Amino acid sequence: VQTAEEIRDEGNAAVKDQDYIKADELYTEALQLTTDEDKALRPVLYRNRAMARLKRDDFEGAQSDCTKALEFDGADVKALFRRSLAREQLGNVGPAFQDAKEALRLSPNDKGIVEVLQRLVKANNDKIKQTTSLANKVTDMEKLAFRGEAKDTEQKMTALNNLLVLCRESESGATGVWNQGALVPFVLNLINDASENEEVTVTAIRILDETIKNSVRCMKFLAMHDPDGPKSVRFVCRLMCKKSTKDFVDATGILVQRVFNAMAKMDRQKEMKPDPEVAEANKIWIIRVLLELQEMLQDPKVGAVQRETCIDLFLKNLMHMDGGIPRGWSWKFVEERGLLALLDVASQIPELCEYPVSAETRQHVAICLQRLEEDMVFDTKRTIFKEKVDMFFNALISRCTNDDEGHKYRIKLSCFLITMLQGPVDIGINLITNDQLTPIMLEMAASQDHLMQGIAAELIVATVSKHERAINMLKVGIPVLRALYDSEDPTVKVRALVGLCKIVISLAKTCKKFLLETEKYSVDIRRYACEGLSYLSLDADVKEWIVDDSLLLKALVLLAKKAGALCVYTLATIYANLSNAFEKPKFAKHHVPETHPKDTEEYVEKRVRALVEEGAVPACVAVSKTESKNALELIARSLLAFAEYEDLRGRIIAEGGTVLCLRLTKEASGEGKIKAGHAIAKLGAKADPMISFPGQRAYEVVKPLCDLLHPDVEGKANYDSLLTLTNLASVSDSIRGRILKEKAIPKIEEFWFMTDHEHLRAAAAELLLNLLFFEKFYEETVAPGTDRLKLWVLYSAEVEEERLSRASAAGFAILTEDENACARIMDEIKSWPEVFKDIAMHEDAETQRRGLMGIANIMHSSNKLCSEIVSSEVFRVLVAVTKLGTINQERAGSTEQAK
Template identity: 30%
Template sequence: MVMRIKKTRPNFWSVLYIGRTIRNLYIYIGTLDIVLSSVKGHRIVARTEANASMQERPLRVCATFYGYGTQRRGGASCTRHQRASYPEEHAASCAVVFPTMSQDAATLREEGNHLFKSGDAQGALSCYTKALKLSGDQTEAAVLHRNRAACYLKLEDYAKAEADASKALDSDPGDIKARFRRAQALQKLGRLDQAFLDAQKCAQLEPKNKAFQELLRLLGTQIQQKVRSCGFRMLSSTDARVQQMFKLLLDDSAQLSDKQKAAQNLVVLSREDAGAEQVFRNDGVKLLQKLLASHHEDIVLSALRTLVGLCTGHQSRTMAIVHELGMPQLCAVMGSGASAVSLAACHLLQVMFEALTEGMKRDIRGKDEAILPEPSRELRSMLQHLLDMMPAATVSGPGRDSAINLLVKQVPRKSLRNPDNSVTLWTVDHGLKKVLEVAGTVPELADGPPLTDNTPMSCSVLLNKLYDDLKCDSERENFNRLCEEYVQYYFSQPALESKVRAIQAVSVLLQGPSDVGNRTLELSGVMETVIAMCASENLIHQQVAVETLIHAAGKAKRASFITANGVALLKDLYKTSENDRIRVRALVGLCKLGSAGGTDFSMKQFAEGSTLKLAKQCRKWLCNDSLPATSRRWAVEGLAYLTFDADVKEDLVEDKKALNAMFELSEDKTVLFAVGSTLVNCTNSYDVEKPDPQLVELAKYAKQHVPEEHPKDAQSFVEKRLLKLLQAGVVSALVCMVKQESPALTDACKECIARVFLALVERQEDRGMVVAQGGGKALIPLATENTDVGKVKASQALAKITITSNPEIAFPGERIYEVVRPLVNLLHLECTLLQNFEALMALTNLAGINERLSRQKIIKEKAVSKVEGYMFEEHELVRAAATECMCNLALSTEVQKLFLATGNDRLKLVVLFCGEEDERLRKAAAGTLAMLTAEQPELCARIPGTTSHWLEILQALLLSDSQDLRHRGVVIALNIMQAERDLTEKLMESEALEILSVMAKEDTDARGPISKIAQQCLEVAVRYGIIKSAEGESILS
C-alpha cells in the first residue's frame, strides 16, 4: 500500500491512496480529503472518492490524523501518520464523522456496562456497537461481542444474540460466559440439541455453577418432551404412508409408473426404524413376496431393497422373513439372469447373515428378541442352499458368482483368534466337491453350469479361504483327500473330456491353495497328461493344459522340471500356433520360467536379451485393442513375471501407452493381482533383506552362490520410475482397484497395493499429488482389512502423509477418526523403530488439531500409555517425538488427570527432560510443562518435589540461547509464581530474579512476548510484596 500526503491549504490535507486486495490483485486509486478542525478534541470529517482500475469498488478509509504534532495520551503516542482500520462503506462516496479521541472503545464499553446494569439494554447495545467499530484488538472485540449478546438476549433478539456469542467464541473458545449466552439463545430459537452441547460444556468447566446446572436440566426435559411428541406424530404419519403404499401396490388397475413410485417409497420408509416396523407389522413381507414374482425388474429391485431395510441390524425380523420367504425363493431370485437383481439379492442375503451372526454374539438382547432361539439352524440352512446353487444348471453365471462371494465372506472366521472354525469344517464336508464341480467346468466342452469369466478366479479364492481357515494337519489332510478323490474320479474316466475337467480343477487349485494343487499334480499320470495335452490338436485341450502348466511353474521344484521338459514345447507353441489365445498363454509360460531367478541378476534362465523380447511382445499384445480381454489379461500376467528384471521395468515405465492400457485393464477383477505384482516390481516395494557384508565375503570364499542386484535397481533408478508412474496416473488406477468389491481383491492383492502406495509417498514432494488423487482415502481400508504386512505398509504410508500434510485437508470430515487406529497400531513393539517414529510424529500432528476430532480418539485407542513407553526409548529422535506427542495430548483434560494422579513419576520425567542436552527434547518437555502448569496450577506445588535441581533446570531454560526455550521457561516461571506465594519466594531468592529483570528490560519488539511475560512475573512478585518497585515509577523503569 502507498500513501502520498500533501498539504494543499491550512487544515486541509489531500491523500493519494493506492492499494490492492488480498485475494485478488485489483489496483484501486483514490483520494482522501481530510478537514481538520481546530476545535478541542479534533473532530475529523473525511470524504473519500474512489475509482477502481478493473472493477468499481468503494475505497476503505484507512488514514486518520489526530493533529499536527505528537500527543501523549495514557502512555500512548499518536502521530499524524498513525493509521486505524474502519469498516468499508458500501458507496462510492461517503461522509464519516469519527468520535473524539477521548471517547475511545474502552470508554464506550464502560459506559455500555453502566447502562446495562441500570436496565437500559438498548443504550448499552448502542455503546457496544460503537466500541466495536473503534476497537482494533481481537480480545477486546470478543468481550464486546459477548456483552452485545447479553443485550440482544434482554431485547429478545435471539438470532443476533447467537451470532454475537459465536463470534466471541471464535476468538476465545474458552469464554464460558459467551458459551452460556449462546446456549440461552439457541434454547429460545428451538435448537435444543446445540444448546444442550453448549450447556454441557459450561457445566463441565464449572460443575458448581447452579445456573449452568439448571439450564442443562431444563434442556434435558425439553428434549425428552420434543422426542416424545415428534415420535408420536411421526409414527402416525408413517403408518398412514405405509398403508397408502400398500393400497396402491395391491391395486391391479393402478398404472405401472405409480406402482414403481410406491415401491420406491417403501424403500425409503424401510430405512427408518419407524417405517420398517410399520411395514413389517402391516403384513408387508407377504406383499413383498408377491412383488418378488413380478416381471418388472424395477419393482423386484425395490422389493429386495425394502427387505434390506427390514433386516438391517434386526435379528428377530430377519428370522421371521427367512421363514416367510424361504431360502429357495431368495436363491432363485439371486440366480436369475438379471445382473442388477442378482446383486441386490446377494446384498439382502449378506445383510441377513450379518443380522443373524451379530445376534448370536450379543450377550444382552432387546425385549423383542428375548425368547428367540439361536439362529444357527437358519444359518446352516442358508449355507446349504448356497452350496446347492454351485452345480445347478438353472443358476445364472452372475448368480453363481454372487453365491461364491457370499461364501467367501461368511464361512471363514473373521479372526484367527476365534478358535471355532466349525462352519468351515461343515462347508468342506458338505460342499467342497460341489465347489470343485464348478472349478472343473470348461464351458466350451461340457453341458455344465453357466459361468462368467470371473468364476474360476472366484472359486480359487473360496478354496484358498477355506484351506487357510483349517487349524490342524488332520483337517488339511481331509481337504487334500476330498480334492484328490475328485481329480482321480474324473481322471479314471475313459473320455478325454473327463480328464480335461480334472486338469481344469487342478489349474483352479494351483491358483488358490497351491499346496493342494501341487499334491494333485503329483498323482500318477497327471503331469504327463498335461504335457501331452499341450501338443493336442484340440484348441480347448491345449488352452487348459498350457494354463495348468503356467500355474504349476510357480513352485521352484516344478519350474525346474518344466524348464527341463516343457520349454521347447512352449517355444514351439508360441512360434507355430495360429491361435492368439494359445500363443499368449505359451508366452506367459515362457515369461514365468524366464523369471524363475527372481531379482537375482546372476541367475539367467534364458540367453541375454530373450527376456526383453518376451516383454516387448507382452506390451504389444497388451496395447492391441483388437485382441479379446482374456488374451490381454494374460499379457499382464507375463509382465508380472518379467518385471523382476530391471531392464524390463525401465522399458515398461517408458511405454506410456502400455501403462495406460494396463491401468484401464485393472478395472477387470481377474487381473488385479497381476497388475499389483507388476507395480510392486516396478517400484521395488518388495522386502529386500540386505545381507551382512562379512557373510557375503564368507560365502564368496566358500564358493557359494551370492545373489547380485541389478545395476538399474539402484535407488536413483527407482525414484525416476516412481516419478514416471505418478505422471502416468498410477494413483487413480490404484484407487479404482481398491474400490473393487470382488473375491479377486484378495488380501494378497491389497498387500501389493499397500506396498506400491508406500513407495509412492516415500518422497515428501510427491505426497501432495497422491492425496489430491484420492490416495489418502484409499489407504484407510487397506490399513484395516489386509494381511498383517499389508496393514503395516498402508499405516506407514498414512503416517508419512499425516506428517507433512494438513490432516484436515488430507482426511476431511469424519475420515480423520479412521486414521488414528492405524497410526496407533504402528506403535506396536513388533514394528520397526522408523515406523514407531513416523507414527509418533503423525499422532503429534493429529493431537494438535482439536479435542473432539483427534485427541479424544487417540485417548480412546489407548495410545497414551504407548506414547509414554516411547518417552523412555534410548534413540534420541524417538524419545523427542514421543515427548512432542505428549505435549499436544496434554491439552486434553483426561491426560492432565494422569499427571495429577499421585504415585507416578510422569511429572518428574517431564521436569528432568527439561534439563537434557537434546534441544528438541527440551522444547517438547518444556512445552508440556508449560501447558500442564497453566491448565492445572496445583501441579506447580509438586515441581520442587520432583528433583532438587528444579531451580537450576528452570534457570537454564531462562538463560538458553534458544528463544523458544526462553519463552517456555518464562511461561513456566509465571505459572509457578501465580500458583503459590511460597514458590514465588523461592524463585525470587534465587538468580531467577536477576534473570527476569534483565529479560523484562529487553526491547519488546525484538524479544516478542518474552519481555512482557517476564514483566508479568515481576508484577506478581510485587503484588505478593516480595519485591518493590521504585517510588512513582514502573517496576521496569
C-alpha cells in the same frame, strides 16, 4: 488333558493382564470342558466371561452370560451388576436400572453399583420424553424416504442417508430406525421395484443392514418371511438375485453375512470367534443357510455375481480355522456334497459352463478350495478330502473320450486342474503326476479345437510350479508350449507366451505389443499379457525398461481400470517388483549382484516417481477388491514404497491412498496389515490432517498407528506414526478421545524417557502437548501423583537442543492455568529455582517466552509461590531494555504479580 478348573484361572489372569480377547475365548474354551456334572463351576464362568465381553463391548454377549449366571443363583450380585451395565449400553435403560437397583440392596456399600445408579437415574428421568423425540426424527425421515412423502430424488436420498447416519450413530439410533421391523418391508419394497436407482436401494439396504447386527433382530429377520423356516431362509439368501448390479448384490450379501454372524455369535471384523454354545443351539438354521447357499452354487438361474458372492460366503463363514463357523461344519461339508459341488464349479469357464460364470469366478473357487482344505486339520479328514477330490478326478477323467461331446469332459477335467493348482496346489500337483493326464494334454494340445489348444498351454503354464517331481508332464509340456506359441490365434499365442515367460527380452518385447494395442486385442487376452509381463519383472533390466516407456504404463492402467481382481496377483507383482517392495533377511564377495543400477540406489525413485505419474494408485484401488491375502500385501508394500518422496504423497493422498491403505489394514493379511499402517503413518505427517483424513476418516486411522508403536522394542516408522498422530490429535477432541482410550499413551510416554533419539522425543513432545490440549488427559497429568509434570517443566528448561522446549514449554504456560498444579511442583521440585532461572532468560526464543509465561502464572496464582522471588525477580527486570524480542511480554508479566 486340560482340566475344566485350571483353564479358568488361566482366564482370570488373562483379565488381569488386560487382554480381554483371550479371557473371553479362554472362558468359553474353559466352559467347553465342563458340562452338567460340574454344575457350579459354570455360573462362575459365565459371570466371568461377561466382564471380558463387557470390556470388548460385546454387550449382547455380556447380557447373555449374566442372565445365564442368575439362572443358577438369582443373588449373583456380580451378574446383576454387569447385566445392568450391559443393558445400560444397549440403550435399554429400563430393566437396566431395576437391575442396577436390586443389585445395590444386595451389597449396600459399593462405590461401583452407586456410580451406575446415578447415571441410570438421569436416565429413566430423560427416558420417555427422549425416546418419543427420536420416534419423530424417525417418522419424519421415514416419511420422505420410503412412504414417498417427498419430492425430487436428492431429498429422498438424504432422508435415507440421515436414516442410515442416525442408524449407526448410537445403539438407539439403530433400534429406532428398525422401528420394530417396519424397516424391513420398506426396504424390500425398494429392492422389489424395477425402476428405483441402485444408490437408493444400496443405501436402504445398508440401513436394514446395521439394524440386524443385533442377534435378536437378525434372527427375527431370517425367520420372518414365511411361516415355514426352511422357505424363509431361502427368501433371504435369494434376495441377491432380485437384481444383477454389482453394488446391489454386494450390499445384499452382507445381509447374509449378518445372518451367519448372528447365528453363531461371531464377527470376523471383530476377531470374535464363534461361541459354540449359540451355534450348536440354532444349528437347524446354520444347516438350512449352508444348504440353500450350497444349492445355488450350481443353480443355473443364479447368476455369476451372486455365484461368486455365494462362494466368498463360505470362505468367510465355514472355515472354522479362519474366524468362521465352529469346528465340525467344514467337515460335514466335504463329507457330503459340499466339496463336490464346490469342485464342479472349479471345472467351469465362461466358454464352456453349465451355469453362468465369469473370468473372476475362478479365484473365488481357488482360495475357497485352498482354505477349505486348510480347514481340514486332522488326518482322518485330510484323507476324506483328498479321497473325495480323487473320486471326482476319476469320474471326470474316465469320460474324456474323443468326441465333440467327450471333448467337453476334457475341458472340465482340465480347468478342474488349473483351478486346484492356484488353490490347494499340493492336492493339484499330486494329481498331474499321474502321466495319464499328459496324453490327454498332448492330444488336445495338438487338436485343432482352438479352445482345447489354448487351455492346454494354460494347463502347463499353470504347472510351471517351482521344483521337480512333476517336471515330468513339463518335460514334454514345456516344448509343447514352444510350438503352440507360433499359432496365429492371439488367444493361443498369449496364453502360451506365459509359462514360456514364467521360466528372454523377446518375450518382454511381445507382452508389450499385446498390452499397448489397447483397442485391437481384447481384455481376457491382455489379462495374460499382464500375467506374463508380471513374471518378467524381477529382473532389473526389465524393471528399468518398462518404466521407460510411457504407453505401457498408460495402458497397463487402462487394463486394471477394466479387469479388476483378474489382474491383481499379477499387477501387484509388477508394481511390487518394479518398486522393489519385497524383502530379505538382513574370502567372500558378491557386492556385484547387488548392482543392476535400476534395482539399487536412486533408480528405485526413477521408477516409483514414474509409475505414480501414470495412475499407479488408481489402478491399485481398481484391482484391490479381492478376498485375497498376499495380493493386498503387495498393493501394501507398493503403496508404502510409493509415499516416501514428499511432493509425491501430496497426490497419492488425493488418489484414494488413505481410504485404501485403511481398508488394507482390516482386510490385508499378516505383514500386510503392518505395511498398510506404516504407509498411512508415512502418508500423513508433513501433510495437513484436514486435507487427508476428513469426514470421520480420522477415527479409524488410529487403531493402526497405535498397534504399530507397541512393537517399540526399536525400529519401524514409530517416528512417522508420531509426527502424524501428533498432527492428528491437533484438531478435534473425538480424535484425542480415541487416541487415549486406545491404551496408547502408556507407550507413547516411553518416547519421552529416551536419551539419544532427539527426534523420537521431539515427536512425543509435540504430541503430548496436543494430547492434553483438552480434558480427560489434562486432569490425569496433574492430580494423581505421576511424576509427569516434572518433565513438562524440566524440558522447557533442559534446552540444549530446542523443540523439546517450545513444546514442553508451550505446555508449561497453557498447563500453569491450573492452581492445584503449582502445588505439586513448588514443593516437590527441589531445585526449581535453577530450573526456573534456566528457562528464565534461556536463549531459546519462544522458550523464554513460553517458559516465562509458564512461570509468570505460577506466581500469579498462589502467594506462597509469588513469595519465592529467589533470583527469579532478577530476569523480569533485565528483560526490559532493548532485547527487541517479545520475551518482554512474558517477562513484564512476572511483574504485575507483585501487587
